[PDB]
Amino acid sequence: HKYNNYEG
Amino acid sequence: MKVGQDKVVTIRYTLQVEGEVLDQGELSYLHGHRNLIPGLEEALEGREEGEAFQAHVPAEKAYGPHDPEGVQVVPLSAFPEDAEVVPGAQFYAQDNPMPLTVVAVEGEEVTVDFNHPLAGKDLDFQVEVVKVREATPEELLHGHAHPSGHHHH
Ligand SMILES: [Cl-]
């Protein structure tokens, strides 16, 4: 599963 | 009073991994409610107030094994504009937040690790059992000890 974006 | 189920236990401790101190200080926890890693709770069971000991906790009884499948390559474009994307940096994906640690950066590709940071590590504790008391009804209701300050780092 790949994620669009990561958050801090 | 001895450490056991439903006691709130105050400990001082030092945590080392391969000869390096990673965490230390003082905490209180409600015993018997899966609040600490299982190997540490097992080592604490039956201990007396005033008693010092060492515990070697294998990865299996600590944060578990390191899964190679948790290490993945993802695009640098996925990280925030104002992010410092460097080895050691922590970010989150949303599944409940799923934490990841950046382990390498190579141009536009970033190698990340979704494993717990201590996965696969054996943990060495020095522990001092400071106080043992009965849990209050509020502590049992919440499943953890009442706040007593941040005294470990
Ligand atoms: Cl707790």
Residue numbers in the entry:
A (entry chain B): 66 to 73
B (entry chain A): 1 to 95, 99 to 156
What are the paper's exact sentences on this?
Peptidyl-prolyl isomerases (PPIases) catalyze cis/trans isomerization of peptidyl-prolyl bonds, which is often rate-limiting for protein folding. SlyD is a two-domain enzyme containing both a PPIase FK506-binding protein (FKBP) domain and an insert-in-flap (IF) chaperone domain. In total, we obtained five structures of TtSlyDFL and three of TtSlyDΔIF at a maximum resolution of up to 1.4 Å.
For the T1 peptide, a single-site model was sufficient to describe binding to TtSlyDFL, and the affinity was found to be much lower (KD = 158 μM) than for the S2 and S3 peptides, which is explained primarily by an increase in unfavorable binding entropy. A peptide is bound to the IF domain in four structures: TtSlyDFL:S2, TtSlyDFL:S2-W23A, TtSlyDFL:S2-plus, and TtSlyDFL:T1. Interestingly, although the binding mode is variable, three aspects are shared for all structures: (i) the peptides bind to the β8–β9 hairpin through β-strand augmentation with two to four hydrogen bonds, (ii) the peptides generally insert two hydrophobic side chains into the binding groove as detailed above, and (iii) peptide binding does not perturb the hydrophobic groove. Interestingly, the proline residues of the peptides bound to the IF domains are all in the trans conformer—with the possible exception of the S2 peptide bound to molecule B in the TtSlyDFL:S2 structure, where P29S2 could be in cis configuration —and in most cases do not form direct interactions with the IF domain. The TtSlyDFL:T1 and TtSlyDΔIF:S3 structures both show alternative binding modes. The T1 peptide adopts a reverse orientation as compared to the S2 and S2-W23A peptides, and forms only few interactions with the FKBP domain. The non-canonical binding modes agree well with the weaker affinities of these peptides, but it is unclear if they mimic any physiologically relevant interactions.
